[PDB]
Each structure stands twice: as structure tokens, then as C-alpha cells.
Amino acid sequence: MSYNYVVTAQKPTAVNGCVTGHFTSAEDLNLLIAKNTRLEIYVVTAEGLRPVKEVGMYGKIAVMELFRPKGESKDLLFILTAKYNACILEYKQSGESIDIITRAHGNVQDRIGRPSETGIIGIIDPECRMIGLRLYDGLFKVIPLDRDNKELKAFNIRLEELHVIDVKFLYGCQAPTICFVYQDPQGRHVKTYEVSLREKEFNKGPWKQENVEAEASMVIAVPEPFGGAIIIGQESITYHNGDKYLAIAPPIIKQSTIVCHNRVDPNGSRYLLGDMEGRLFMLLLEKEEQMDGTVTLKDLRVELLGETSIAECLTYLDNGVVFVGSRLGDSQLVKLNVDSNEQGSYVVAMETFTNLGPIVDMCVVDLERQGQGQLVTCSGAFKEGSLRIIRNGIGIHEHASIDLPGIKGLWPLRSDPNRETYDTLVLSFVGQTRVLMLNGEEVEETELMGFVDDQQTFFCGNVAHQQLIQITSASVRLVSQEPKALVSEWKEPQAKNISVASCNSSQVVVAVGRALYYLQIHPQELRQISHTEMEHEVACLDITPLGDSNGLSPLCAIGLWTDISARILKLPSFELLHKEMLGGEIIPRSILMTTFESSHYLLCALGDGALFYFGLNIETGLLSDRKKVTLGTQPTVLRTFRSLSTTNVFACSDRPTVIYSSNHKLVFSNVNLKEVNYMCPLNSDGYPDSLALANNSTLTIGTIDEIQKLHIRTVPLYESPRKICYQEVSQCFGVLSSRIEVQDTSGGTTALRPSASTQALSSSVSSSKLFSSSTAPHETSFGEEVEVHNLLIIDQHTFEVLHAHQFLQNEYALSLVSCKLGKDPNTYFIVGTAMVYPEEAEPKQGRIVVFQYSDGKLQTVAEKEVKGAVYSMVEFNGKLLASINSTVRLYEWTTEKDVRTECNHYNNIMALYLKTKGDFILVGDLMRSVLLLAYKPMEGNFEEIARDFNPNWMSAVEILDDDNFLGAENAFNLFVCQKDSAATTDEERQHLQEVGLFHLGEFVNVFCHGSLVMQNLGETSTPTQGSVLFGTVNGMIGLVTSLSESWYNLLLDMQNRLNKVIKSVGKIEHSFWRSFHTERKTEPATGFIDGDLIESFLDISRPKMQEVVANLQYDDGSGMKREATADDLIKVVEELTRIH
Amino acid sequence: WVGLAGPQILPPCRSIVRTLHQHKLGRASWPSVQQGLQQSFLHTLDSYRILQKAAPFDRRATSLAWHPTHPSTVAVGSKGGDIMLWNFGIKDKPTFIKGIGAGGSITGLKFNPLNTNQFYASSMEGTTRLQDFKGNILRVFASSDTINIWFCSLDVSASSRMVVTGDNVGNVILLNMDGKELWNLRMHKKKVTHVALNPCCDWFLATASVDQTVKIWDLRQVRGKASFLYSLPHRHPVNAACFSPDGARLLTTDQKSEIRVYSASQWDCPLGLIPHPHRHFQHLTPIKAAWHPRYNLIVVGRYPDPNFKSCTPYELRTIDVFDGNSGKMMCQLYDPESSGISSLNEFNPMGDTLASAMGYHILIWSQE
Secondary structure, eight states: OOEEEOOOOOOSOOOOOOOOOSOOOOOEEEEEEESEEEEEEEOOOOOSSEEEEEEOOSSOOOEEEEOOOOOOOOEEEEETTOOOOOEEEEEEEEEEEEEEEEEEEOOOOOOOOOOTTOEEEEEETTTEEEEEEOOOOTTEEEOOOSSOOSSOOOOEESSSOOEEEEEESSSOOOEEEEEEEETTTTTEEEEEEEEEEETTOOOOOOOEEEOOOOOOOEEEEEOOTTTEEEEEEEEEEEEEOOEEEEEOOOSSSTTOOOEEEOOTTTTEEEEEEEESEEEEOOOOOOOOOOOSOOOOOEEEEEEEEOSSSSSEEEEEOOEEEEEEEHHHEEEEEEEEEESGGGGGGGEEEEEOOOOSSOOOOOEEOOSSSSSSSOEEEEEEEEEEEOOEEEESSSEEEEEEEEEEEOOOOOOEOOTTTTTOOOOOOEEEEESEEEEEEEOSOOEEOOOTTOOOSSEEEEEEEEEETTTEEEEEEEEEEEEEETTEEEEEEOOOOSOOOOOOOOOOOOOEEEEETTTEEEEEEETTEEEEEEEEOSSSSSEEEEOOOOOTOOOOEEEEEEEEETTTEEEEEEEOOEEEOOBOOOOOOOOEEEEEEEETTEEEEEEEEEETTTTEEEEEETTTTEEEEEEEEEESSSSSSEEEEEESEEEEEEEESSEEEEEEEEESOOOOOOOSSSSOEEOOOOBBBSHHHTTEEOOEEEEEEEOOOOOOOEEEEEEEEEEEEEEEEETTTTTTTEEEEEEOOOOOSSSOOBBSOOTTTTSSSSSEOOOOOOOOOOOSOOOOOSSSSSEOOOEEEEOOOSOOOOEEEEESSSSSSSOOOEEEOOSSSSSOOOOOEEEOOOOOOOOOOOEEEEOOOEEEEEEEEEEEEOOOOOEEEEOOOOEEEEOOSSEEEEEEETTTTEEOOOOOEEEOSSOOOOEETTTTTEEEETSSSSEEEEEEEETTEEEEEEEOSSSOOOOEEEEEEETTTEEEETTTTEEEEEEOOSSSOOOOOBBBBEEEEEEOSOOOEEEEOOOOSOOSSSOOOTTTTOOEEEEETOOOOOOOOEEOHHHHHHHHHHHHHHHHHSSTTSSSOHHHHHSEESSOOOOOOSSEEEEHHHGGGSSSOOOHHHHTTTOOOOOSSSSSEEEOHHHHHHHHHHHHTOOO | OOSOOOOOOOOTTOOOOHHHHHHHOSSOOOOHHHHHHHHHHHHHHHHTTTTEEEEEEEEEEEEEEEOSSSSSSSEESSSSOOEEHHHHHOSSEEEEEEEOSSSOOEEOOOOOOTTTTEEEEEEEEEEEEETTTTTTEEEEEOSSSSSSEEEEEEOOOOOTTEEEEESSOOOOOEEETOBBOOOOOOSSSSSOOOOEEEETTTTTEEETTTTTTTEETTTTTTOOOSSEEEEEESSOEEEEEETTTTTSSSEESSSSSEEEEEEETTTSSSSSEOOOOOOOOTTTTOOOOEOOOSHHHHEEEEOOOSSOOOOOSOSSOOOOOOSSSOOEEEEEEOOOOOOOOEEEEEEEEESSSSSEEETTTTEOOOOO
């Protein structure tokens, strides 16, 4: 046992670099974004970006550069993976088939050597002669790119300058000429060399060297018309041409460091400078035409253009449009100005591309209708600081929406018989019916002749003999298409009101009290052909023709009022073909027959929102397999639409749902909406293949998502968001924020820019006196200048997430953990404080503070000073377990409401992460792998059970069950530990064996249980067992799942065959990509399966599909083995996608 | 000298919390966080000051091996021929093998990576045994054939399934773990003090000798008669040359007062030189510098010398811990009433416990 499944819900949203050029065409301007393992290719249109292809790579994209070799009609792509996979890639379109082809590829890693602290640097010769990389300190790697070299074989040059800050190839020199800032005991200097592929060594650049501004980080290669290099730092920008030196130190840089640059003008006239505060500067190179000896640089000037979101990189596109590649907040697309408007802004956000990263913490919550589940709330972080609310479902894209309250039903209509499409939408209210004529996208209240609007319509629609029908409460009206005229009218003989209706193309079944009349639609003729009475009142009706029925249904489905039954009647005669008892008391509210994948069903929904459904036999009217689902407390109204050729059912209630079948069992995709009362398909000229959806206040025309999707809401804080948790009782979230303030001339503090805790009506500051400060202000991080943390707790509501109450912590307390709890009284918010002084590396002064919130009043209840830094806390069997530093404390809460020191565990170095299950306690000790503790009652203390050997620098930790433990470490790997018991007094039961390895490629803060999909009892399938969701620093949020022993093998096998097919996007072997990697270790990876390989099964040709299934012995649950077909696996993978 | 002018650690004044959160946000290079942890460790190492468990056996300590997995199990070799398999934190009377006592010094011992109930040994009896701790041989991997020729120094690589032994004359034998000879060429002119094959590159062997050189070899490529890849010259005889975990960088410890780091991007010339007294004495096991298995640090026994140019005014029989990029004293470990010259010092697999062969004694340094 111990088999695991990793599948990407979401996908990294952070930009790790973006490059511009002519990849797709040549006439095209392309933008290429790297997400992590994802490559997104775009074309720049007059108005924005047009997405052509997104590719996934078996690697973390480290270098992504476009280059044009001589004799190539377009730019090629060069990619380097962080696992050192290099490749040249080419865009190819086979008429309609998009293909990225691997021109050259290889693993360029040395067979030894430690990566530089500054990371991989890749640069391409301005003449595409060669590729130069800095992988390790004191070596320069050169790939001879020139001429045919297809395995990307590469040599190394010794680089006496050990500590390289930044390299770039210079423009316009008689040899490949490399320029770099380095660091030695003397400071930082710029030096240059020449690279000769010929002799394989440096030779010496166009100038010996220069001293460089103390903190010089960037090296910009300036193009032909100038040809120098720009060197950026803090407080200074310099130009070096080689003999020519010119520098400036504009005051408006001293606020934050310059992270990124980008050339605006092909000649190199202007450059864009992204900040760290999230500023945007224009760099201007002063052209001075001299007289003969022609263009010379006069000066440098910089001008603030305004504020973007915090940029990891940027590229200007054209027409003053810029793409902002952000990793800390939402990436964006912006317009620049010639003349700045109000508040001196040349910058305006055009499009905001949402990004979840980093995600410091997250929790799972059941908010919408409480029926499982399903939403995740996460994080942030800086001024980009935000709360993201993410939930799973089928989204609707609104194209029109009218404030039109109290709709009581909707019907599409073709007024024009010559027209294919709908042109009229009819709605009914309590009072009456209104008619909406659809012109363009324009709706229009008219009337059609023959339709009354005195009272409510129960049904209307196109009908048999080129006619319209309107079944009102009062009557049944039959209108003629050509000359719109009432052509026949049926009323209940004794002038009574219709109480229930139903209608297909040629048959009608109305109901009065108990009575039922079956009418038929003929030219000009509403011919009544049958009249019965029912045992009790008629609740609802359906006469939908099923399958080979000539629009003429042999059956009639009906729900009854007091006996609460859903019975099938033989239509012609009303011969009761099958009665079915449902439940007690609650009156059935909607009934419908329908065909799913050529199998026939009878669905039936009640006034409490409970839906039954049966397998209806068309012949015998036989119902079988009574299955029952609850879906929201509103009486669920049923309806139909057509998804492809396939036909689904919309379940209109407070918790709207769309039902369809996949194999022969039916699936409930949750619709991403507030209430929906009624609904109908509208295929208008102006609204093609759309839906009319009415809630209590609003008509809506729109388009429905093809498949269940995954969907996000932003709540901006302008603060770093840190930790979060949900206090379900006080209908409230609690968030630990923290804001940068600048140390003042006097006492420090003072924020820049208002944030969630500054805009805070009802806010507090505990001035708890338990600490004693130094007599002389020990101001470090500048004794009067630079920044300070400042950390408070905040309260977000629930729905609406207005910020209720803000509370400033100890003033120097960093505060690292958050909790919603009980031990006897009320539900408290407990905060584990840090107490960081600039200034000392080790923290040695905790504080656990207990809070009680209500009515915007947030009250410091209890308190306990600790002698360390409370790294995490957990509600544990009624007690509050806490890691302090090396120590793991238990803490108890007695009357007098104080937190009182129970038993301890001492043997740890860091102890940053805690996770309990029952009486078991998982401990991520940062400085030495992970350990299992038990609280033993009958006993009252801690007992080490098992330690993992091999020392993992874990990112976060998680329990999967009392035997398996999940870790993610700084290596972007995952590991799984194991319990046991071993014979004869000696315990390897004390050894937490580690039994699963997997290179994720992401960095995991927070795991947590819960899911985004609703889970089904008896049916569905159990290749899924657990559900643990996890947050990435790139905003990718995968889930892990417990697999069957049987299942694991099948999928393990699948992978290998899938691997034989699937053109890898740089001939990177998948098994390698996944195989567990450290700077010291590399191992195959076991116990895990990536759904991302499994799911990419649904994306290949049916031949290649059959190739993978060839020779496969498959168990379909029958136990009797059979040859597997391509379809057996499609409905297996199909299922597995429906688990996130 | 400096492996890039300091791996300077993260955010203003670098409080670990500040550094850890930075790492969390994506804003912090792992190598930076690393350094922060390293500092955090270096601090705990000052309270390591406690020897929590001491022991002897007899004669003198000559070989130290940490059990590859258990962070409590330690093997110790003796000039006599003694082997102690000691799991401290168990109080269970260490498994013991008594040796010859006459010759029979254990000049080297590594645990059998493929089976930790067994160990390998470089014996002054002239044999490299593969032997069970329950004192019984399985196969003598090499025996001398002339008296006065014995072996001094082992390694052994689970991964490539190799065994290398250096004899006291300069010969190096290379064996596969079945016992078949692939080597024998006299790689060095005098006693081969230390043999160590690269943790990250199966076939990349470093051999250090009394001939005042360290040699670097390729086994799969250059079997062809005593014609290595690099030979590093030293001021004196070399006591030990062992690789950093990860295989880049080699830690050379000479016989008098010089320790060297050699980078993988070079090998040929030294990255830095750390001056540090360790001298030769009569009944003293040669001092050897070692890496900390996890952080970038160096451990050594200091052996005060009135002639060595001391930088510090206070020169005791301390356990020295050097940076390893800076090359500069990160702290000293010293227990009056227990300290003497600490020949050997190795950290755990986990690097949270320090085993010290203190000439005659075995010391276990741990945090309170």
C-alpha cells in the first residue's frame, strides 16, 4: 500500500519571464509567456493578445530566448530547463495542425558542479553564432549554435571571475563579445571578454574594466546605433560604450531597487524600467548628432510614468501597449501616454490577467448552499496582496441581463415559420405574460396576436401544424403562424382554471384540480381526446416523446399531490402503467422523462430539493433503480438543453446543477451561479446556442460553459496576507496581514499607501505591557530611514468580504499562526506571535494571544508569553498544540480562561510545521526531516513514535492517514513516509520509512484536506480515495489522492505506453522530468502518478489511442478479464478529470 | 579564495523568520535560505557545547564511521584491531570485535552500504575485510602477499558497486563488490593515506598520499597504467582528501598546518587555503578535516603549535569549525575536563550530532 495521484487543479499563474519576437510567422509579432512548465504563445492584435498555442513542458523553464539564424524565415525558440534540458524549438502549422518541433535537444548539465546562488543565466549571441550560459561558478558554458549541431554538445571556458552578477552579449564587435558585472573583495566591476568557438577560450574585450556602482545588478546590451551597455543598480544608471562612460543618479530610484528592464525602440533609444515598489520608468538615451562623426550619446534621463503591478519582467509590445509579467500579483496589459492625465499617470491598466501566486496559506470552505463543497480561499502578497476565492463549476457568460423581477417562466419561440432560429422570448409573471421580440441583440416588448396577457402562461411554444400554442391558466390557445390569429381555444367545460400544464409538438395534457384532459394539436383544431380523474391533486406533468417516438408520446408522466407519487400513465387511455411512492409530506414540484445516451430515464424533484430518478422502460412504463440526490433546498424545476448533439438537464434551484451521462451513469456538474428559478435554451439570431436564465430579480441571456471549469474572485488588501482561517460560528474569516511602513525621523512606523488595516473603521491595538524595551532605540535596517514590518489580524465577513475589524499586534511582533477554536466557552481567534528584532537572527520571545470577536468588537481574552517564536498551532482534541522553537508544547485551557502549560516535546531543531490526526502529531522540523509524536492519554504526555531518516528541508507537511505522511521540500519534490511494527523488541517501527518520491516542479506552502467537487455515494468510482489540495508559490494548486493497489499498476503501465506516444516538447523524457532530484540525489520516483500524463490521454488520435490500449488486459470491475478498448479508458480518464 | 564573495543571507539583518517568509514568497534564492539555516545551525552548535555521551575501548582510536541511516549508530576502529558498533541513546553495551592488538590497526572503516550489518576494513594486518559486526569475515577483498605491506585507507560506493583500497607503499587496488580486481597500478610513490570516490560521479576517484600529492582519477576511462587526471602538489604529506556531499569541492588536510578546498570547476588549483595546526605526533592518529553532511562547513581538531602563526591570541585543543567558502573560523568546540587532541571528527548523516575520536576516547557532542 501507499499509492498516490498528483493532478494539477489550476496551473501556475505566475509569469517567470516573457519574451517578444517573430516565433509564429515573421509578419506576426508574438509574445511568449513562461508560466513554469507552461509556454503560452500569442499574437499581438490591434486591441490585445490572440492566443495561438499553450504548450506544457516536462521541465521548469529556466531560459526562454528567441533568436534568428541566417537562412531562417522566422525566429526560433531556445529553452533551458532548470534540470538542464536544452532545446531549439520551431512553430509549424500544417494547415490547421499546430506543432512545436524539436530542432535540436540535449541535457547540457556538467557531470559535477553546484549551481550559482544567482541562478542560471542564458544569453544568445546577437548574431546567433553561439549560446552562452552560466550554470556554475567559475565556468562559462558555450553551445556551438553555428552550423549543424543537433544534440547541443557544449564546451566550457574557465572564468577567473568567480562571482558573476549578470552577463549579456554586446552588439557590434568583430567577435562574440561578452560583457558582465562580477564581484570580488574589491567590490563590483564590469569586465569584458571575447569568445572564440575556434580555440575555445576567452580573448579580451574592447576595454580592460571599470569600477561599478556598489550594487550593480543589470547589464543591458544596447543595439547597433549606439552599441554600448547600460548598467543599472540602486541609486545609479551608467552607460559604458568602451572608452565612453556616462552616468546619472536620479533621486527617484532610492525608494526601491530596479528588478527589470526592457527595450522599447529597436535602435535602443528608450528602455522600460520596472521597479519593486511596482513603478514604471522610461529610460531615455539622449541622441546627439554631432556633425560628421555622427551619432554620439549626450546624456541619460529617467522619468516616472506611473505604477504598474509588481513586475517580474516586462515587454513593450507596440502602440504604447506593454505586458507586465508579475509573479507577486496579477500580471497585466497596459497603455502608455504621451501626456499624463489626472495624478500624473501615463499608465492605464487595459487587461488584468489573474494570478494566484504566491499563495502563502489557504483554507477550504463550504459556502454556496453548504452542499459539498466546495470553495478554496487563499492568498497574496505585497501591495499586490489579495484574498482569492476559488470555486469549481460550470460558468455562464452573460451577454444580456435585464432587471426584470419575479419571472415565473420562460419560453423560446419562432414567430417566423420560415426561420430556423428563435426570435421571441416569452416570460410569465404572477399578473400576466409579456412577450419579448428579439431583433439583433436587442430585446423588445411586443405582443403576438392570439396570445393573451391577462393572466399567467404555464406553457407556450412552436407546435404541430405550423402553429403556436399558449396554455394559460384560464385556457389553451392555439395560434396560427401565418396570419397570427387565435385559431382554436380549449377551456375546461365548466369554466374552471387550469392548474397544471404540459405539451410537446403535437399533444397537450392539462390538469384541473384532480382532472386531466388529453388534447391533440391538429390544423386549426384543439381536439380533446381523453378525460380522467386522479386519486389526488395533480402536482406536475410531462409528456416528452422519447427516442423513436414521432413527436407523439405513448406515455405520460405525472406527480400527485397528497399521496406523493410519480406515476407513469399510458397516454392514449390514461392506463396507470406504474405507480411509485416517493417520500412523505413534501409535494413533488417537477417531473420529466428523458433520454440519456439512448437510455431512458424519469427524473422527479420535490419541494425540499430532493431529486429521484429511475430507468424508465418505454415499453412497459417500468421504473427501476430508484436513486436519490439532494441538491439545494429550493423546489428544483427541471428543463432541457442540448449540449453538443447530446442532451442535458438543467436543474433550476437555489443550487443550480446540470445533469448529463458519460458512460451510462449520470453526472452532476455544479452550475456556477446564485439562484436560478427558471431557464430555457434560446437560439436567437443575436444569441446563438444560448440560455435564458431567470432568478428572483433578473433575466439573463448567455452562453453555458462546455465542461466544468474552475473559477475565481479577488479581494484586494494592499497588504501581505500571510495566514488565513474560517470561523464558521461568527460567520467570519480571520486573516493575518502585514504592512511595510517606513522608519520616521522621530518614532518609526508610518505606512506608505493605505491598505486593508488603515482603511479600518473599528480597529484596535493591544498594548499588553509584558515586554520591556531597550533604553537606547536599537534602530537597525537604517536608524531613521528604511522599512519595518507591522503585522495585524483582520476580520473578513463571509459573503461580500468587507473587512470587519483590524487589529495591530505587539508592534514588533511578527505573528506567524492563526486559529479558530474551542475548549469550553466560545469560539476564539488565537494568534501565535513572533517578536522579531531587525537585528537578531534567532527569535527568543513568543506570545500566544487568544481573541474573541463579535459586533466589530475584537477583545484580547487571554495571553501567554513564550520564550521563542510560535511557528504553528493546532486545535488538538480540545487543547491548543503549539511549536515554539525547538520545543513542541501542548497547552491547556482551564476555567479562569487562561492557557496553561501541559506536557512537552523537546527534541527538534526548527519544528515549523504541525499536523495532527486524532492523537497523532506530525512535525516538520525544518532542520532535519520529520517526525511522528503521540499524545497518550491514560498517561498525559508526548512519546516519539518515529522519525524519518534522511533529512529533507520541507516546505510544508501533511497527514494522509495514520500510516502515510506527505512532505514537499526546497527541491520541489514530494516524499511519503510510513508506519509499521517490527518483530522481537527491536523496532524499525521507530523508523518512518519513506516510500514515495516525486519531483513536482513547484514549491508547496500549505497542504489541506477538502475538495472542489461534490462526491457521490454508491456510484462514481474509487480510483480516488483521499483529497489533499495544496498551494504553490507560482499559484499552481494541485491535488493528491490515495489510489488502489490494483489501480496504481494499471496507471503505472498507462504512463509507460503513453510515454511511447506523445511528442515530448523538447524530447525531454517524462520519467526523467519527474524523477526525484536534489543537488546530491536523483532517483526514479515511485508511489506517485501524475494525472497530467493520465489526462493528456484524452488528447490524442483514436489510432494512437488504440495503440496504447493494444494488448492491455483490463478489469472493468467484473473480475473476468477482457481485452480493453480505447473507449474503456476514455470513460476511465473521463471520470478521473472529474475529481478536481 | 572565497567561493563567490560570501553567500550573504537574505533580508535586512536576516532574522530567520524574515528569511523563511521571504523563501515562502518566492522572493528568496534557496542558496540564501540555506545560508540562513547554516547560521541558525552554527548558533545551535555553540550549545552543542555539551558532550552528551563519552566512551573508550582501548589502545587508541584510528577509524570512524557513522551508520549511513541511524542517527545514533557509530562504528569506531582501533590501532589494536578493535571494532565498536555503538548506538548511543540506547544504553545497550556496544557490539564489539577485539582485534590482534599487535599489528592489526584499523586504518579505515566504512559501513557496507548494501548491508549495514557488515562493514569494510583497512587493516594493518594487510587485509581489506568485508566483515559482520558479529565478528566474522565474509570475504577478504585484498590481502598483502608481502609482510610490511598493508593497507591504510578505504572507500566504497554502493552506486557503482566498487571498493578501493590504498596500501602503505602507494598501490591502489580497485574491486567490484564480488571481489574481482580491476586495478593494482602503483598510483602513488608512498603510503596512500586516504582514498575517496566521488558521491555524485561514480567513476571519479580522489587519492591522497604521503608522497605529498592528491591524485584524481577516472576509473571507467583511465585504467591505462598510472596516468590520472590531476595531481595536486602539497607543502607536506597529505593526511586526507575527501569530497563534499554533492561531489563539487574536495577537502585536503595536509600533515602540518594546511587545509585546502579544491573546486570541481577547477580541481587543479586550490580554491582557498585555510591555515590550521594539526601536525604529526608519535602516538597520535593523524588529524583529518571533514565536511558537514548538510551545511557548507568544515570540522577539524586543532592541535596548538608554538611555531604556527596564530591569528587568534588564544590557542587551545579546540574542535574547529570553518566556513568553507570564507574559510574562517565559525566556532570552536571545547570542553575543559574532556578535551584533548581530537584526531577525527565526523557529523551525523543528519548533521545534528558530532562524533569525536579524541585520541583514546569517543565523544558525542549534542545540543542540550
